């Protein structure tokens, strides 16, 4: 009740502290794994003869 | 104290070198971007209810919710008490 009308008006607005990158990040592209992974996986199955 | 303008060739008093250079190299792309921004924020319809409508809705909620508000406690949906 004792909050004056000036105090009521002087209430600040809430501003976000996160920057542009945090709030609205650019779309994160998804890419396939490099072919070296398949190459090394198929090389893993290879075994010596001695 | 007149210094020749490197961008226009005219003479400006030295009290206005930095401001003249900053304004002189101002991209019109800034002007069109600002005009676009002004057009966007002055044409989007408000999504949330106005303040008086929020207050009226909260008053109706308090009237119909006596398990939270009021003195006497009626059922969850009833308004008599």
């Amino acid at each position: 009740a004792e909050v004056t009308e000036e105090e009521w008006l002087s209430i600040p607005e809430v501003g976000d502290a996160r920057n542009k990158r945090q709030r609205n990040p650019r779309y994160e592209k998804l890419t396939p794994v490099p072919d070296s992974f398949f190459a090394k996986h198929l090389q893993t199955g290879e075994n010596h003869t001695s | 104290e007149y210094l020749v303008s490197p961008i226009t060739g005219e003479k400006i008093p030295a009290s206005k070198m930095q401001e003249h250079m900053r304004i002189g190299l101002l991209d019109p792309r800034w002007l069109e971007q600002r005009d676009r921004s002004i057009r966007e924020k002055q044409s989007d319809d408000e999504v949330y209810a106005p303040g008086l409508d929020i207050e009226s809705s909260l008053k109706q909620l308090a009237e119909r919710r006596t398990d939270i508000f009021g003195v006497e406690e009626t059922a969850i949906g009833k308004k008599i008490g």
């Binding site: - | 989007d44 319809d45 999504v47 949330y48 209810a49 409508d53 929020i54 809705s57 909260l58 109706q60 909620l61 119909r64 919710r65 969850i76 949906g77």
Partner: protein, 141 residues
């Protein structure tokens, strides 16, 4: 729940459905005091800004505005219905009732996905869209 716009008579609901030509008119039928409606309205409030490009959300009290109770079978604590260009867009949620969402959701992304699917299907000119998620079960384990 109280931050959303409210419609106070059937004519207002009709005008809100008629006014929007390029956005889905999401209207929640229920009571601001019902806990299920409180949950649904909180979910709708969390997404109201996000979907404002292709959806508008209104709340209607079925006691203050009983003009659609018999028509739309609004005899559930909470009900969410979708309209696009003066046409009620049904959705195949897998619940057996394809006309409305009669429960309260908990995921904002769920409701956003449903709104987006309704928007796309209605833009293509379809009266029924298939929900990306089935609701024949609550997936509780």
């Amino acid at each position: 729940s109280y931050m959303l716009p409210h419609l106070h008579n059937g004519w207002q609901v009709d005008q809100a459905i008629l006014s929007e030509e390029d956005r889905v008119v999401v209207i929640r039928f229920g009571h601001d005091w019902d806990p299920t409606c409180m949950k649904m309205d909180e979910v709708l409030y969390s997404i109201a800004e996000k979907v404002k490009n292709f959806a508008v959300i209104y709340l209607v009290d079925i006691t203050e505005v009983p003009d659609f109770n018999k028509m739309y079978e609004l005899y559930d604590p909470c009900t969410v219905m979708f309209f696009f260009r003066n046409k009620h867009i049904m959705i195949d949620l897998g619940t057996g009732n394809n006309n409305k969402i009669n429960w309260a959701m908990e995921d904002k992304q769920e409701m956003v996905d449903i709104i987006e699917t309704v928007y796309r299907g209605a833009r293509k000119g379809r009266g029924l869209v298939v929900s990306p998620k089935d609701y024949s079960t609550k997936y509780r384990y």
